[PDB]
Design an enzyme around this catalytic site. Structure first.
Site, PDB file in Angstrom:
ATOM      1  N   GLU A   1      35.845  37.273  31.384  1.00  0.00           N
ATOM      2  CA  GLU A   1      37.144  37.296  32.036  1.00  0.00           C
ATOM      3  C   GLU A   1      37.535  35.851  32.339  1.00  0.00           C
ATOM      4  OE1 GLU A   1      36.913  40.559  35.088  1.00  0.00           O
ATOM      5  OE2 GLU A   1      38.154  41.413  33.508  1.00  0.00           O
TER       6      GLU A   1
ATOM      7  N   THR B   1      39.882  41.717  39.385  1.00  0.00           N
ATOM      8  CA  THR B   1      40.398  41.577  38.018  1.00  0.00           C
ATOM      9  C   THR B   1      40.791  42.912  37.399  1.00  0.00           C
ATOM     10  OG1 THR B   1      38.253  41.795  36.976  1.00  0.00           O
ATOM     11  CG2 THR B   1      38.927  39.564  37.655  1.00  0.00           C
ATOM     12  N   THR B   2      40.680  44.003  38.158  1.00  0.00           N
ATOM     13  CA  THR B   2      41.209  45.295  37.721  1.00  0.00           C
ATOM     14  C   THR B   2      42.122  45.809  38.810  1.00  0.00           C
ATOM     15  OG1 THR B   2      39.597  46.797  38.781  1.00  0.00           O
ATOM     16  CG2 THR B   2      38.977  45.827  36.684  1.00  0.00           C
TER      17      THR B   2
HETATM   18  N1  LIG Z   1      36.116  42.865  38.442  1.00  0.00           N
HETATM   19  S1  LIG Z   1      36.001  42.587  40.017  1.00  0.00           S
HETATM   20  O1  LIG Z   1      37.084  41.751  40.429  1.00  0.00           O
HETATM   21  O2  LIG Z   1      34.674  42.137  40.374  1.00  0.00           O
HETATM   22  C1  LIG Z   1      36.259  44.017  40.829  1.00  0.00           C
HETATM   23  C2  LIG Z   1      37.306  44.908  40.488  1.00  0.00           C
HETATM   24  C3  LIG Z   1      37.523  46.104  41.189  1.00  0.00           C
HETATM   25  C4  LIG Z   1      36.718  46.444  42.261  1.00  0.00           C
HETATM   26  C5  LIG Z   1      35.676  45.593  42.619  1.00  0.00           C
HETATM   27  F1  LIG Z   1      34.870  45.908  43.670  1.00  0.00           F
HETATM   28  C6  LIG Z   1      35.452  44.397  41.917  1.00  0.00           C
HETATM   29 ZN   LIG Z   2      34.463  42.649  37.418  1.00  0.00          ZN
END
Ligand SMILES: NS(=O)(=O)c1cccc(F)c1
Ligand SMILES: [Zn+2]
Length: 257
Positions: free
Chosen positions: A103, A195-196
């Site tokens: 990412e 990031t999601t």
């Molecule tokens: N990909 S991340 O930003 O680590 C992430 C996304 C959604 C929920 C979470 F706890 C962590």
């Molecule tokens: Zn992540």
């Protein structure tokens, strides 16, 4: 609902999650020459000796190894952080090909995958409260390159056959996440987001400079997972990464020169 396909992927997320176009979105490109060395940045303190893993889950977007976060068993402190952040889960993002999957990028370089160890600030009491705060989460990001195997990853790889499809979970006790770390804890740090979806702007990102190496066979096994549930049309869980977002009014800081 949201995903990583042509019809529900990152370019669509803003329609349900308008914060997708916000002021502190992640991931970003780390331009190494413009990152600022900050001599005031403290060494990271990773205290994982008492970690209690519980379970591994395919959630339709990645797989999460979940931990008991009801006590200070596995914590992150120091670095840019004030206070104590408890490990709740880790997961990965990866590609369909070795040349993509991470990412964050480094001088525009993509790694084969990226590990996220997700921690929440204990002054907020639980994870759900923490994600509503600008300093609620600390995510430790570690790049994966394809080379030699990572022995500490193998127990994860070997359980993936039991959680092939969305909604499947398996017991996953006594896993030691220390076996996923590189040798150096040198890092870059910047304020960002999940990031999601829901893309909440609650994360202090700490991205390690040193990648870990995993084998071709290890990453191939990630690529055999499915986004779909059992009995639904099979779609391989690959390319579950969001591309780099604009840095906007942020400076990335480095713990090292
Ligand atoms: N990909 S991340 O930003 O680590 C992430 C996304 C959604 C929920 C979470 F706890 C962590
Ligand atoms: Zn992540």
């Amino acid at each position: 609902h949201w995903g990583y396909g042509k019809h529900n992927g990152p370019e669509h997320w803003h329609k349900d999650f308008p914060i997708a176009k916000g002021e502190r979105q992640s991931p970003v490109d780390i331009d190494t020459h413009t990152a600022k060395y900050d001599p005031s940045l403290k060494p990271l303190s990773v205290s994982y000796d008492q970690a209690t893993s519980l379970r591994i889950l395919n959630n339709g977007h990645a797989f999460n190894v979940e931990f008991d976060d009801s006590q200070d068993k596995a914590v992150l402190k120091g670095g840019p952080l004030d206070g104590t952040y408890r490990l709740i889960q880790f997961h990965f993002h990866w590609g369909s090909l070795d040349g993509q999957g991470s990412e964050h990028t480094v001088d525009k370089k993509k790694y084969a995958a990226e590990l996220h160890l997700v921690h929440w600030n204990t002054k907020y009491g639980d994870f759900g409260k923490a994600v509503q705060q600008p300093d609620g989460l600390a995510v430790l990001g570690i790049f994966l390159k394809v080379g030699s195997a990572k022995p500490g990853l193998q127990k994860v790889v070997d359980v993936l056959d039991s959680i092939k499809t969305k909604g499947k979970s398996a017991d996953f006790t006594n896993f030691d996440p220390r076996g996923l770390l590189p040798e150096s804890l040198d890092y870059w740090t910047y304020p960002g987001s999940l990031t999601t979806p829901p893309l909440l702007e609650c994360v202090t990102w700490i991205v390690l400079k040193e990648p870990i190496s995993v084998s071709s066979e290890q990453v191939l096994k990630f690529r055999k997972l499915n986004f779909n549930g059992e009995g639904e049309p099979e779609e391989l869980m690959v390319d579950n990464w969001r591309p780099a977002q604009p840095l906007k009014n942020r400076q990335i800081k480095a713990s090292f020169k």
